Amino acid sequence: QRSLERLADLLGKIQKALGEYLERERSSFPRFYFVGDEDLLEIIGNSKNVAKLQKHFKKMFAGVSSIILNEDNSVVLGISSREGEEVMFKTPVSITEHPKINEWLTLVEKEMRVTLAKLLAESVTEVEIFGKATSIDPNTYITWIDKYQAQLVVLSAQIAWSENVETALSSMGGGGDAAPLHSVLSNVEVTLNVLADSVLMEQPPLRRRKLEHLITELVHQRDVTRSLIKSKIDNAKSFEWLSQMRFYFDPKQTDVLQQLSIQMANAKFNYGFEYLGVQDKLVQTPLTDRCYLTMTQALEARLGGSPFGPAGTGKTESVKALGHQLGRFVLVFNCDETFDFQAMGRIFVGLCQVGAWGCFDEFNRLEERMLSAVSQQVQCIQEALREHSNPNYDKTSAPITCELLNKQVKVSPDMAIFITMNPGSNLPDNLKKLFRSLAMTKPDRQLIAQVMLYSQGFRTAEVLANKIVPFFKLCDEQLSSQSHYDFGLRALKSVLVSAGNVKRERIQKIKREKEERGEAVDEGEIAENLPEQEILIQSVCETMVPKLVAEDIPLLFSLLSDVFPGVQYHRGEMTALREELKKVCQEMYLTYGDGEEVGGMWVEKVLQLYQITQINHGLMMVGPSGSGKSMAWRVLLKALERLEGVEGVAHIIDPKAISKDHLYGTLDPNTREWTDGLFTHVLRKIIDSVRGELQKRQWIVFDGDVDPEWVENLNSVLDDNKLLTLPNGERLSLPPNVRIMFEVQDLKYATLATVSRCGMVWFSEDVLSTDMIFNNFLARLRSIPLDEGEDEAQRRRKGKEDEGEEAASPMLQIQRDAATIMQPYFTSNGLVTKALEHAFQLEHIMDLTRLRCLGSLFSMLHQACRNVAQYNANHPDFPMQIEQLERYIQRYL
Amino acid sequence: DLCSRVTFVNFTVTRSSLQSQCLNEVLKAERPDVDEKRSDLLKLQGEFQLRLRQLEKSLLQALNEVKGRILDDDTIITTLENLKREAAEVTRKVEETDIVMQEVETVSQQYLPLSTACSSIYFTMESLKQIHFLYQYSLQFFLDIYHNVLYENPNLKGVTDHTQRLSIITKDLFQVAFNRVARGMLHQDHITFAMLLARIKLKGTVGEPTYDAEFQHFLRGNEIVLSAGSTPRIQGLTVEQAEAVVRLSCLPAFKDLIAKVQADEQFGIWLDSSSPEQTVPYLWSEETPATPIGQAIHRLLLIQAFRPDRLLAMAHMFVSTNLGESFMSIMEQPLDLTHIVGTEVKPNTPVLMCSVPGYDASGHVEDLAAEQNTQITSIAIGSAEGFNQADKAINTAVKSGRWVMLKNVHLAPGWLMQLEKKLHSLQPHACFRLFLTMEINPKVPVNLLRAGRIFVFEPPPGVKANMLRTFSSIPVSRICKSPNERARLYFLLAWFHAIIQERLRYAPLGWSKKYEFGESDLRSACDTVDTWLDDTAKGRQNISPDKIPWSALKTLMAQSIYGGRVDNEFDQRLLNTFLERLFTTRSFDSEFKLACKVDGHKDIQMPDGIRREEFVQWVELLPDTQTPSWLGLPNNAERVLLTTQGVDMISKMLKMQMLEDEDAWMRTLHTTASNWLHLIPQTLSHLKRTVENIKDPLFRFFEREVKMGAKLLQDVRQDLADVVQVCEGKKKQTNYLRTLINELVKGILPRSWSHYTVPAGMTVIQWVSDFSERIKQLQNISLAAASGGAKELKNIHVCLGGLFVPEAYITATRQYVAQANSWSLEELCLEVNVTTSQGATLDACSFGVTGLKLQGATCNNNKLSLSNAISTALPLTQLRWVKQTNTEKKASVVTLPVYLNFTRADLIFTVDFEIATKEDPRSFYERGVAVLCTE
Numbered sequence A: 001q002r003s004l005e006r007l008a009d010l011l012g013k014i015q016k017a018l019g020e021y022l023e024r025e026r027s028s029f030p031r032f033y034f035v036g037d038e039d040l041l042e043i044i045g046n047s048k049n050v051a052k053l054q055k056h057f058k059k060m061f062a063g064v065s066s067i068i069l070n071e072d073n074s075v076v077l078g079i080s081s082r083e084g085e086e087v088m089f090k091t092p093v094s095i096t097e098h099p100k101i102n103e104w105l106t107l108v109e110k111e112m113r114v115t116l117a118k119l120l121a122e123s124v125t126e127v128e129i130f131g132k133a134t135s136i137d138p139n140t141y142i143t144w145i146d147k148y149q150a151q152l153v154v155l156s157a158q159i160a161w162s163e164n165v166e167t168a169l170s171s172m173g174g175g176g177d178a179a180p181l182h183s184v185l186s187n188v189e190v191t192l193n194v195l196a197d198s199v200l201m202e203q204p205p206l207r208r209r210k211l212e213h214l215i216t217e218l219v220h221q222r223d224v225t226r227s228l229i230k231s232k233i234d235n236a237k238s239f240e241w242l243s244q245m246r247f248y249f250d251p252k253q254t255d256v257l258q259q260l261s262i263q264m265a266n267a268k269f270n271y272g273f274e275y276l277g278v279q280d281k282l283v284q285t286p287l288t289d290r291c292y293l294t295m296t297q298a299l300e301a302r303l304g305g306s307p308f309g310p311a312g313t314g315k316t317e318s319v320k321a322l323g324h325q326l327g328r329f330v331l332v333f334n335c336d337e338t339f340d341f342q343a344m345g346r347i348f349v350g351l352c353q354v355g356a357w358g359c360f361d362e363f364n365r366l367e368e369r370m371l372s373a374v375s376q377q378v379q380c381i382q383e384a385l386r387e388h389s390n391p392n393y394d395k396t397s398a399p400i401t402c403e404l405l406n407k408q409v410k411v412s413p414d415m416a417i418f419i420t421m422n423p424g425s426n427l428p429d430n431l432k433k434l435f436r437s438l439a440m441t442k443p444d445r446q447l448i449a450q451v452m453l454y455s456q457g458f459r460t461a462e463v464l465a466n467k468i469v470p471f472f473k474l475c476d477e478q479l480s481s482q483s484h485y486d487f488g489l490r491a492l493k494s495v496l497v498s499a500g501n502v503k504r505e506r507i508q509k510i511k512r513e514k515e516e517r518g519e520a521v522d523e524g525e526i527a528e529n530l531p532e533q534e535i536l537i538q539s540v541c542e543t544m545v546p547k548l549v550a551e552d553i554p555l556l557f558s559l560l561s562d563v564f565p566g567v568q569y570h571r572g573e574m575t576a577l578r579e580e581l582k583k584v585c586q587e588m589y590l591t592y593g594d595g596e597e598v599g600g601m602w603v604e605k606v607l608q609l610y611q612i613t614q615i616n617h618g619l620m621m622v623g624p625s626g627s628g629k630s631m632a633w634r635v636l637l638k639a640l641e642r643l644e645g646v647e648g649v650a651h652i653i654d655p656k657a658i659s660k661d662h663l664y665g666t667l668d669p670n671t672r673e674w675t676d677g678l679f680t681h682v683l684r685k686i687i688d689s690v691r692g693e694l695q696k697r698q699w700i701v702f703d704g705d706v707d708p709e710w711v712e713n714l715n716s717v718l719d720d721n722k723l724l725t726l727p728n729g730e731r732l733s734l735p736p737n738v739r740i741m742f743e744v745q746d747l748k749y750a751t752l753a754t755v756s757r758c759g760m761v762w763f764s765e766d767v768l769s770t771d772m773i774f775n776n777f778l779a780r781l782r783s784i785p786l787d788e789g790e791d792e793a794q795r796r797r798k799g800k801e802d803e804g805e806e807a808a809s810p811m812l813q814i815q816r817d818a819a820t821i822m823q824p825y826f827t828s829n830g831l832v833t834k835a836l837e838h839a840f841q842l843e844h845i846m847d848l849t850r851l852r853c854l855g856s857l858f859s860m861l862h863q864a865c866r867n868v869a870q871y872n873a874n875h876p877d878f879p880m881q882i883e884q885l886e887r888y889i890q891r892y893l
Numbered sequence B: 001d002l003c004s005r006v007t008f009v010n011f012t013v014t015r016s017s018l019q020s021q022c023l024n025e026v027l028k029a030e031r032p033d034v035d036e037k038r039s040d041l042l043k044l045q046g047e048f049q050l051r052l053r054q055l056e057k058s059l060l061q062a063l064n065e066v067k068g069r070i071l072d073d074d075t076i077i078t079t080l081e082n083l084k085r086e087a088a089e090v091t092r093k094v095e096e097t098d099i100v101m102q103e104v105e106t107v108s109q110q111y112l113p114l115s116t117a118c119s120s121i122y123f124t125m126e127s128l129k130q131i132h133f134l135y136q137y138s139l140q141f142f143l144d145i146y147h148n149v150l151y152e153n154p155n156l157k158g159v160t161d162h163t164q165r166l167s168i169i170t171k172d173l174f175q176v177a178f179n180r181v182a183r184g185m186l187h188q189d190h191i192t193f194a195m196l197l198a199r200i201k202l203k204g205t206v207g208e209p210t211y212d213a214e215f216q217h218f219l220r221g222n223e224i225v226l227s228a229g230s231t232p233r234i235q236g237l238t239v240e241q242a243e244a245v246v247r248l249s250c251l252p253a254f255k256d257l258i259a260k261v262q263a264d265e266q267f268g269i270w271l272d273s274s275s276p277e278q279t280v281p282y283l284w285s286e287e288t289p290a291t292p293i294g295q296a297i298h299r300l301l302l303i304q305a306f307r308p309d310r311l312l313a314m315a316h317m318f319v320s321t322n323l324g325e326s327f328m329s330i331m332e333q334p335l336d337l338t339h340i341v342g343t344e345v346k347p348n349t350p351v352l353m354c355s356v357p358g359y360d361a362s363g364h365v366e367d368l369a370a371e372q373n374t375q376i377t378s379i380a381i382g383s384a385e386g387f388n389q390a391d392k393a394i395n396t397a398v399k400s401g402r403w404v405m406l407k408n409v410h411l412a413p414g415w416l417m418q419l420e421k422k423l424h425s426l427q428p429h430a431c432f433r434l435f436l437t438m439e440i441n442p443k444v445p446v447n448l449l450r451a452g453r454i455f456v457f458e459p460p461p462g463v464k465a466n467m468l469r470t471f472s473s474i475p476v477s478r479i480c481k482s483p484n485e486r487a488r489l490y491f492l493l494a495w496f497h498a499i500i501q502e503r504l505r506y507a508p509l510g511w512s513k514k515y516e517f518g519e520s521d522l523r524s525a526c527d528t529v530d531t532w533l534d535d536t537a538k539g540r541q542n543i544s545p546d547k548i549p550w551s552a553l554k555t556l557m558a559q560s561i562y563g564g565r566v567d568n569e570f571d572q573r574l575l576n577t578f579l580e581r582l583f584t585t586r587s588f589d590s591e592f593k594l595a596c597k598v599d600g601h602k603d604i605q606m607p608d609g610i611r612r613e614e615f616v617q618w619v620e621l622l623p624d625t626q627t628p629s630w631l632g633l634p635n636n637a638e639r640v641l642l643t644t645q646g647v648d649m650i651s652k653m654l655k656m657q658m659l660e661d662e663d664a665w666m667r668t669l670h671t672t673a674s675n676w677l678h679l680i681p682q683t684l685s686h687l688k689r690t691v692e693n694i695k696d697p698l699f700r701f702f703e704r705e706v707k708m709g710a711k712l713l714q715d716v717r718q719d720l721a722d723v724v725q726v727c728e729g730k731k732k733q734t735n736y737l738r739t740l741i742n743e744l745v746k747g748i749l750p751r752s753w754s755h756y757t758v759p760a761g762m763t764v765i766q767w768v769s770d771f772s773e774r775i776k777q778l779q780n781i782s783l784a785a786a787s788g789g790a791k792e793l794k795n796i797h798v799c800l801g802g803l804f805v806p807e808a809y810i811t812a813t814r815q816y817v818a819q820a821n822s823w824s825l826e827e828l829c830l831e832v833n834v835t836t837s838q839g840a841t842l843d844a845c846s847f848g849v850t851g852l853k854l855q856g857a858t859c860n861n862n863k864l865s866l867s868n869a870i871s872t873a874l875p876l877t878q879l880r881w882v883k884q885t886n887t888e889k890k891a892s893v894v895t896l897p898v899y900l901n902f903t904r905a906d907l908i909f910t911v912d913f914e915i916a917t918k919e920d921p922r923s924f925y926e927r928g929v930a931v932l933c934t935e
């Protein structure tokens, strides 16, 4: 008893001491409660090899995908974003000098803050230099833009505009002379013209992202300045100007943290300098301005925020954007059967420790017990927050704390908590006295489209946006909605981005043509004389018509003609790929067409599939059983291989026939080793490229229905990163030859998050006609014998004409005669087609299927000609007489 | 199996069981002489025989052991005489097994209506659950009422006559039951409970007829349907009153009502009188002089038919003339909590009290404890330490005889359940009362509501009371702080908060929906004003009225504090007009009118004082009269609210009739199913699709809508066929079938039938009526389109009410004219033209719309004017899509929302109307003018 009790006390005390050391580390650096403790312990155990730690850095930071290492990985060089953007420390910190994880991580964080503050000071200095001039050099502008990171560039532009207009207000000071306001507006207009000219040319993707961000900011600044000039504001303390977010930069502050202060309306916020990599910049519509004002007032009053309303209006995105503009790291909590009560307590402790913004996306989807539990948690932490709000409590010595995990946890006032709701319901009754509420009833899609379309580089944007937004509203109203349809703001943004890319491709094509022939190349001259309506319509067609049911395509075209009058789209012609596709179709025994013919729908569908696989690296096929999606896929692969000279290799994998663990690899709980899964092993094989498959192209089909339970591993591949995350922790990229696929009957049980990451082509069941399938069957009868087995299947790799094999066996002649005699009954209005149409009206014991009936018929006719062959084998004296064959085949048919 | 393996015992309560219980209780309690005679009737059996045989057994035990001493003192002969007397006495009792039985039978027959009334009252109290989830009353509660009436009656003192005792005990029972139930009951339902008790006493009393037909018409007079075009026109009254007379005329005593009202000349001054219930005329036909109760019922039917907004007042009058004028006078008084907590609260029953959200009741009990000099501990129920504090406090107080505060316990239903489980099995002190305070929520345990002395606390209405509550909640020092204009700003904010908060009461006219403008919003507004005033003043004693940040306060209260919950653009605009009218520099003038056009002639002049005490004095000197003109609503808003409360009371008491009266449902289901299959149409016809008609937007909408509507119609007809098949018994039912049948029986709207837009909380009969109207319109448009093609479809007049999505109809006509004129959709704007003419010539861009209604205004020559009518029936409305030219906004243009139904929950489109006179567009917004597609 005593011997067992000693071990019981000792092992528990050792575990408690390890936990106390971990908690001391998390007290030395507050960022540490965010990572799970079971992963933090193996992080400590593997401090020398931080390659495994690289996976945990995504949870560690906001957008820092990995940390840059030295050649001996003992001194950190910097941090990389999700794409690979780097920032450089002034004096790099050595992990060997300070082996403690908490010490070197907090050194990294503090020096990151001070170095981005210093480069921000240099940025605002050079942007002041740029803005003080009437004209700006585009080369110097682009040099600065590529020199400095995207968020710092946008923030520097905001600070420069804010100080310009503030100096304008202080310079008038009741004098009523609008000269400095007009000069600021003219400066912003000139910079907008310069950058709109700049974005037209071809740029690196990061430069393009920065240019989009700066147009998004500058249109808002110009609109604010125009509204202020219209309002005729003469004093800097008027509320018409005070309601807009002012940026106050103080370089004279010795401490870098209190250098930047952001004030909107009344609250005096402070910038928490954190690295965000590259984020998405939301356009400052009046709705988002009102949201910013209300959340700023709520945080000033130290209450909560709860923007309620219908989904897809920008609630959690607006909260995230406000957190980005404030510099706080932002977590978005999924509230759909992904509830982890034990983790959320530690997350809340970390939020109280450092300060981070957490938004509960769709809080109405939880069940009562967890609603009550997390409501009690958010209630106690909100009351802890409000312990700082009261003025009767002193602030010079204020250890504001909360009872979290039965522990006194230090709380800083920097954090914020938001709870998104979706009525249609209300907040729980124990939180209504603490959380403000917002009405996100309707976004300003017209202004969103206008600003995004203007940032794409369009000469005209207002009429195109004011057409395309009611166009999408009209399309959602008039189109018979299905499960995979989406006409939301995300769809609008994707359509406009595709339109900008199409316009840039057109610019490149016309420039290359005019360089090939003899003229003078002028990018602006090419730019002004192009139909933006035609470009946008072509983009809508190319990104939406494949995703559309055959019933809805002429309705969509009629809506397009109603909204954009006097303009029509002419589809581009792909002669080389069409000819190669026709040759491959003739080789592989199919039916081809050239539009509005037999097989013309299939041909234009697979051409649309090529367009989608050129635009995006991941697409789906959502035809029913009997839609030809896999065969169109194979035909396109074999045609592209012959056209480009690049070998096409297929990897068809059934996702649900095999287990998900055997598909994505299985982790070893003991004696740790990695067993590769099917798709992961194929991707590892092409990454290694032992047989030189990086020069060739690989397509991978997941031939089976999609579920949210197994596509969570493919979300990290189907996003813009194209980085397959694995429990091993090693990073696998997707080379451009890889184009992942999906072969699904329907998406009745698939998430819209997985829908949004891929394009889709809807192969309607009226694509393969009965005549088409009859042509395939007759071609297979006339070509493929029925007695050679699989030994001669490898013999097909000789010449495709198969010369000298005409008199290989009399079976080929017999079945050719059979195909000839069954030809008149396989017409468009033939007996088989009429009988199939009539039996469609009848009901059977199972569900009738056209290819099922046809396949049974074809198998029995194969057995009929085999019976003729057996009769001839048993009758070597006389062959099978022609009229007897006529009667037998007719009767058997 | 569990049924077969055990035997069943039912200690259940029913009419006969409670009748016999009350009869036994009243005979044991009140009547002494026949009480003793009937206890002697229970002594007719062999109790004395058993005692005598016990004495005989003792004597026999003392008989065998004898040695010549049984002739001791001649005392045995006394016992022999006693036993002979007892034998003769029980023999006489056996001989009297008819006379005494007849006497006690007559005595019990004297007390039969009293026990019938007791059973009816308890069954109504049990049926009170279906009115509201809060009304949970128990058999122990009713027996407490009965014992308090029978035993502790102060009226019975000094009275010896048995008939007088009967009358006193019946009146006291009714009064005490009404008081005890209504103390824990909302103010909107006191009249309902009083009406039920009056019906019970009218049934139980003798000498008065049943009035069963009158009651049935008074309850379900709107359930019958009138033929279209069968209502004639009668002068001196409106259309709705005409159909009300038509519905009323079915009664045998009301046949000559039309002739009487046509021959009556003084009818106008009564129909337009403020209180027609005082001087209601003589209109009922009768052959004998009716009782006061009968004439009250007849005039109540007359008031309900003619002026439904006075239904509450006339029901009050009927309760007064049936059960006493002082019957309801107890409820119109401050609560006497002292007597209740000292006498009528059991020590093991916690005093349960409830309130509407935003209002507390702890101050009442704090004052009660202060005046009762009893120590009470305050515990807040919001966490585990609060649970432990509650546990230790209750286990201390159960012995020490103290009182326990358990604040806002509605957050923990499981804690409430286990606390009631604890309270079922403890021995409490004689002075231990547990005061549970919580808001009215459905998460409170139903058994906890059943096992508690419930109470209801409500905030009284009236702007004066609202501002008094606001100024009492706001501390004096906050307003007293410098500058001196802070008091005036706080008075303005309090007036505005009271105005909006009591504008909530007149929904949907006051607001499109009932927001929660509670105390947190008031605190946020006060903090905002404090911060901005501090920033502007910077410690100065006095600041100029012009230097006040009016723009800051207006924008913040419009977008952040009060406008945060406002999801409607038009409610946001109304809030904006309120803030622009109130928060301005012009308010600080002595001539500022805080509410214009009050009562049509006067104005509420803003007080000129600069002190909190002066403002509070002005508030306390406010007149007790109040009309919606104080809030800015039209003066008919009170009448609309009163008639809404009247129809709500009628429906609530109709729920009582169909549940408490069960002497069944299949027999009524036969008639309802046959009638519904009768008036519902036969079939609908689809429209043929052609390559030329494929471009018709109304054909596209017709295709989608009529596909889903043919699905809906085949479902409805097939389900009605299934219902009547089950009615005839040759078809069984599945779970879906029985749930649908139960919903059709109870009147709850079928969810599978309801997948298009309908008003909330609406009845299946009205659903059948307006759905048959929609199907008739669809048949008309299908027939016209099939007969004429698509050319006349532009000229066909379409009612927006009968359309399923008139928003899609508006988009259809805009894309139709866009296709016709080859214009972009952005280059089109909508212009409205209300035409009083019938079948006017329509342009190529003009359309026909019927059925529109205008609320709170009148339309004349496309120009609006303020009107005192509740609703005006708009004539044929024209929708013209002109090109969106660069036209400036006129000073007399107004944008009106067009809601589909009266609830104003959904929005369709907006119109553009002119103004005839120079009435303020702010006045239009304050009055709340809106357009309704259907009434």
Ligand SMILES: Nc1ncnc2c1ncn2[C@@H]1O[C@H](COP(=O)(O)OP(=O)(O)OP(=O)(O)O)[C@@H](O)[C@H]1O
Pocket (backbone or CB within 6 Å): A589, A590, A591, A592, A599, A602, A623, A624, A625, A626, A627, A628, A629, A630, A631, A632, A743, A744, A745, A768, A772, A773, A775, A776
């Ligand atoms: N162009 C074509 N001409 C004639 N027949 C064709 C053509 N394309 C496909 N088929 C026939 O259609 C059949 C079904 O097509 P495919 O093999 O692509 O599968 P699918 O219908 O998409 O099935 P699933 O739902 O299982 O993915 C093929 O087996 C082939 O016989």
Ligand SMILES: Nc1ncnc2c1ncn2[C@@H]1O[C@H](COP(=O)(O)OP(=O)(O)O)[C@@H](O)[C@H]1O
Pocket (backbone or CB within 6 Å): A281, A282, A283, A284, A285, A288, A310, A311, A312, A313, A314, A315, A316, A317, A318, A361, A420, A443, A448, A489, A490, A493
């Ligand atoms: N101001 C804006 N600018 C650009 N896109 C926006 C803006 N507001 C919302 N969106 C888009 O609308 C979508 C809303 O999604 P999200 O906010 O995540 O869900 P919910 O709206 O249900 O909270 C996002 O995909 C976002 O891209």
Ligand SMILES: [Mg+2]
Pocket (backbone or CB within 6 Å): A628, A629, A630, A631, A743
């Ligand atoms: Mg396939």
